[PDB]
Design a protein around this motif. Structure first.
Motif, PDB file in Angstrom:
ATOM      1  N   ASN A  44       0.796  -1.225   0.000  1.00 62.84           N
ATOM      2  CA  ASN A  44       0.000   0.000   0.000  1.00 62.84           C
ATOM      3  C   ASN A  44       0.835   1.285   0.000  1.00 62.84           C
ATOM      4  N   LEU A  45       2.155   1.156   0.100  1.00 61.98           N
ATOM      5  CA  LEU A  45       3.016   2.328   0.267  1.00 61.98           C
ATOM      6  C   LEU A  45       3.935   2.561  -0.935  1.00 61.98           C
ATOM      7  N   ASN A  46       4.201   3.831  -1.234  1.00 65.47           N
ATOM      8  CA  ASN A  46       5.201   4.214  -2.228  1.00 65.47           C
ATOM      9  C   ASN A  46       6.535   4.449  -1.506  1.00 65.47           C
ATOM     10  N   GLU A  47       7.599   4.835  -2.214  1.00 62.28           N
ATOM     11  CA  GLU A  47       8.906   4.946  -1.549  1.00 62.28           C
ATOM     12  C   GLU A  47       8.946   5.949  -0.400  1.00 62.28           C
ATOM     13  N   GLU A  48       8.404   7.149  -0.602  1.00 60.13           N
ATOM     14  CA  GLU A  48       8.408   8.151   0.464  1.00 60.13           C
ATOM     15  C   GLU A  48       7.560   7.711   1.646  1.00 60.13           C
ATOM     16  N   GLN A  49       6.424   7.087   1.360  1.00 60.06           N
ATOM     17  CA  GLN A  49       5.563   6.572   2.413  1.00 60.06           C
ATOM     18  C   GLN A  49       6.265   5.439   3.155  1.00 60.06           C
ATOM     19  N   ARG A  50       6.919   4.555   2.406  1.00 62.05           N
ATOM     20  CA  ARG A  50       7.678   3.464   3.006  1.00 62.05           C
ATOM     21  C   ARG A  50       8.854   3.989   3.824  1.00 62.05           C
ATOM     22  N   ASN A  51       9.581   4.942   3.253  1.00 64.38           N
ATOM     23  CA  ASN A  51      10.690   5.578   3.952  1.00 64.38           C
ATOM     24  C   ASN A  51      10.232   6.280   5.227  1.00 64.38           C
ATOM     25  N   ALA A  52       9.079   6.940   5.158  1.00 69.71           N
ATOM     26  CA  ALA A  52       8.542   7.639   6.320  1.00 69.71           C
ATOM     27  C   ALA A  52       8.165   6.663   7.430  1.00 69.71           C
ATOM     28  N   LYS A  53       7.485   5.581   7.061  1.00 67.22           N
ATOM     29  CA  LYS A  53       7.049   4.583   8.030  1.00 67.22           C
ATOM     30  C   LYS A  53       8.237   3.907   8.713  1.00 67.22           C
ATOM     31  N   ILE A  54       9.244   3.552   7.924  1.00 70.96           N
ATOM     32  CA  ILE A  54      10.436   2.899   8.452  1.00 70.96           C
ATOM     33  C   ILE A  54      11.207   3.853   9.360  1.00 70.96           C
TER      34      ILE A  54
END
Ligand SMILES: *[C@@H]1O[C@H](CO[C@@H]2O[C@@H](C)[C@@H](O)[C@@H](O)[C@@H]2O)[C@@H](O[C@@H]2O[C@H](CO)[C@@H](O[C@H]3O[C@H](CO[C@H]4O[C@H](CO)[C@@H](O)[C@H](O)[C@@H]4O[C@@H]4O[C@H](CO)[C@@H](O[C@@H]5O[C@H](CO)[C@H](O)[C@H](O)[C@H]5O)[C@H](O)[C@H]4NC(C)=O)[C@@H](O)[C@H](O[C@H]4O[C@H](CO)[C@@H](O)[C@H](O)[C@@H]4O)[C@@H]3O)[C@H](O)[C@H]2NC(C)=O)[C@H](O)[C@H]1NC(C)=O
Ligand SMILES: *[C@@H]1O[C@H](CO[C@@H]2O[C@@H](C)[C@@H](O)[C@@H](O)[C@@H]2O)[C@@H](O[C@@H]2O[C@H](CO)[C@@H](O[C@H]3O[C@H](CO[C@H]4O[C@H](CO)[C@@H](O)[C@H](O)[C@@H]4O[C@@H]4O[C@H](CO)[C@@H](O[C@@H]5O[C@H](CO)[C@H](O)[C@H](O)[C@H]5O)[C@H](O)[C@H]4NC(C)=O)[C@@H](O)[C@H](O[C@H]4O[C@H](CO)[C@@H](O)[C@H](O)[C@@H]4O)[C@@H]3O)[C@H](O)[C@H]2NC(C)=O)[C@H](O)[C@H]1NC(C)=O
Lengths: 209, 34, 207, 34
Positions: free
Chosen positions: D17-27
């Motif tokens: 469900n996540l794009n790179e920035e969303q994934r980077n933010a979550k991590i």
């Protein structure tokens, strides 16, 4: 970028331990130029010059340099008794000749302990299974390991390099892969180990179901 | 790979009855044989 | 002139979120005369400025050595981004460039098997517990041992070895007092690899 | 190590469900915690 480089390599452990084999020391010269392609080798054994070396033809590398190799055959007992071998390399590109010396690892030898380990219960779901040979407590690190079955060499095996153990000795593992059916049929497999601290330089351990 | 030849080489290598020249000679004989 | 080498992060550092993975650019054979070294870093072609560069160190052969360290995102390394170190020095006619990235090819999950000591070894005061880890790709992996919720320290692990099918294997050996083994204590081999669920798996071993 | 933070990290790494920035933010969020 002037000035060749020299590296000196010892014989293979098996070649020094088996009388039927021929151990040799190898002197390798890299970064030899097309402008200065001639290389001369002088070999010495405990400071005494010897003349039985054979020089290989020069080989061109991808980086447009030459690679030149000289091979000296040595007596098994000479290497095992710790004689020093010296290679002296002359080339016009060098301000002075380059000298390298090698000899067998020094120290009191220790005999390897050899253990065979059957496949894990977990692994029997596969078409092939792993037979393990553990070799530990040996010094120096010069050693060879092979596998056999029914008086024939097995080829599908790999051996880890020697690893320094906490007590200053070395250990390694060797892994033989076989068809599960060969294992289940009760065929006997043998792990052969060669080291200078072993009686006759040789020992064998068997493994079967 | 012959078992007998390994035994001869190893004993000759550690033979207390021989000097360097004699042991070298014996080892060459074994080598010629195996 | 000088020479450049670029080194990847440690395997455990890229797999464990509690750790900090870094790429290391090393410059050797820097002279006394032209000691100034310049680093430009790129991530998939995009310049980054957060590298930590150490002061030059004089070596035994009287040359200088200069190191630059770039911290990387776990997910960036694992997803195959390319890292480039570009080094400028006046002794160099043109800048030297090096690039590294994670090994390409299909990841394969490691198979982990624990093997008890040989019956032959039970004549010893100490015995060897074996962990076989095979069939994994790429070669980045870490192995540890524990017992009773505490780390065991007396173990050694072989480097990865290329197998016939293009995958890798290794062995890990834990040495314990025979009495602990016979006591029925449970020992666990912990393995970390990118192809494992949560990058982590554990296999147990006991008598 | 903390098992919980490791589990969260892996989930975010493979979250569809996540794009790179969303994934980077979550991590990045997970990293801040434990
Ligand atoms: C131009 O290009 C040249 C070659 O092309 C390049 O090759 C590779 C290596 C790579 O760089 C590519 O980019 C490119 O294609 C290049 O030459 C190299 O120069 C470097 C400079 O240092 C050398 O560096 C290291 O050399 C030692 C290890 O060499 C062995 O292992 C290599 C692989 O790991 C292998 O490539 C080598 O050929 C060599 O292999 C061994 O060879 C011996 C001899 O044949 C074998 O043993 C003998 O052979 C028989 C068996 O066939 C028989 O058994 C006999 O009894 C036995 O005696 C042996 O089995 C074999 N082993 C293996 C594993 O293959 C290394 O030890 C050394 O370390 C020392 O020096 C360092 C200095 O840098 C120190 O830091 C260090 O502490 C240590 O003291 C070097 O690290 C390299 O070997 C060269 N490569 C070759 C192929 O020769 C050249 O530099 C390039 N020039 C320029 C300007 O760029
Ligand atoms: C002058 O002296 C310079 C120093 O070298 C020294 O030489 C002698 C005389 C003595 O003083 C010793 O101090 C030393 O040997 C010398 O510089 C060396 O130059 C050679 C080339 O000429 C370089 O060669 C090889 O480099 C690669 C391997 O390097 C690693 O392994 C070495 C031991 O095997 C080790 O010494 C190195 O420091 C390096 O170690 C790795 O370092 C990285 C980065 O720090 C570590 O990774 C980081 O670790 C962090 C830890 O806090 C953290 O985890 C981070 O996340 C992580 O990124 C890594 O862990 C560590 N590993 C180990 C095991 O220690 C080798 O790959 C390379 O091979 C390539 O190039 C060859 C070209 O010849 C090819 O043949 C080959 O095929 C391949 O392509 C080189 O072979 C050497 O690294 C240099 N040494 C140093 C210390 O920098 C200089 O050359 C000398 N000059 C003259 C004229 O003599």
């Amino acid at each position: 970028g002037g000035g060749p480089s020299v590296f000196l390599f010892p014989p293979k452990p098996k070649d020094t331990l088996m009388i039927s084999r021929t151990p040799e020391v190898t002197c390798v010269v890299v970064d030899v130029s097309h402008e200065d392609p001639e290389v001369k080798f002088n070999w010495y054994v405990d400071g005494v010059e010897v003349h039985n070396a054979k020089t290989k033809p020069r080989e061109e590398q991808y980086n447009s340099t030459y690679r030149v190799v000289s091979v000296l055959t040595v007596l098994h007992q000479d290497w095992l008794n710790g004689k020093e071998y010296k290679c002296k390399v002359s080339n016009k590109a060098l301000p002075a000749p380059i000298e390298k010396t090698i000899s067998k690892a020094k120290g009191q030898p220790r005999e390897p302990q050899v253990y065979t380990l059957p496949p894990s219960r977990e692994e029997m779901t596969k078409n092939q299974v792993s037979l393990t040979c553990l070799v530990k407590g040996f010094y120096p690190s010069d050693i060879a390991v092979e596998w056999e079955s029914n008086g024939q060499p097995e080829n599908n095996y790999k051996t880890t390099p020697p690893v320094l153990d906490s007590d200053g000795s070395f250990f390694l593992y060797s892994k033989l892969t076989v068809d599960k059916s060969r294992w289940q049929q009760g065929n006997v497999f043998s792990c052969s180990v060669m080291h200078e601290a072993l009686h006759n330089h040789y020992t064998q351990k068997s493994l079967s179901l | 790979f012959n078992m007998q030849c390994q035994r001869r080489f190893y004993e000759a290598l550690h033979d207390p009855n021989l000097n360097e020249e004699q042991r070298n000679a014996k080892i060459k004989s074994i080598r010629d044989d195996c």
